[PDB]
């Protein structure tokens, strides 16, 4: 009801190196699916891949195939029902 879900960058510690998204399959005021991914990142360490598991509503996206985001900061605000993962 009015509550959405955002995804923040989560791979890296707060202090080290950045990662940039590397799959991009969604957009600002756009809505996902369980086979449509919203974004995912790959860094030289790990491959972190951010699925849906459900159809929700994202509203705005700032970081891009080529932006680098950071972690203790959300990025992207979508609508789904209620995960464990950010809760």
Same mark, same amino acid.
């Given at each position: 009801?009015?509550? @959405?879900?955002?995804? $923040?960058? =989560?791979?890296?510690?707060?202090?080290?190196?950045?990662?940039?998204? &590397?799959?991009? %399959?969604?957009?600002?005021?756009?809505?996902?699916?369980?086979?449509?991914?919203?974004?995912? @990142?790959?860094?030289? $360490?790990? =491959?972190?891949?951010?699925?849906?598991?459900?159809?929700?509503?994202? &509203?705005?996206? %700032?970081?891009?195939?080529?932006?680098?985001?950071?972690?203790?900061?959300?990025?992207?605000?979508?609508?789904?029902?209620?995960?464990?993962?950010?809760?």
């Amino acid at each position: 009801m009015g509550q @959405v879900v955002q995804f $923040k960058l =989560s791979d890296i510690g707060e202090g080290i190196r950045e990662v940039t998204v &590397k799959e991009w %399959y969604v957009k600002e005021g756009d809505t996902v699916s369980q086979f449509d991914s919203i974004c995912e @990142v790959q860094s030289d $360490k790990a =491959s972190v891949t951010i699925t849906s598991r459900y159809d929700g509503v994202i &509203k705005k996206l %700032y970081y891009n195939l080529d932006d680098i985001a950071y972690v203790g900061k959300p990025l992207v605000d979508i609508e789904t029902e209620a995960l464990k993962d950010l809760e």
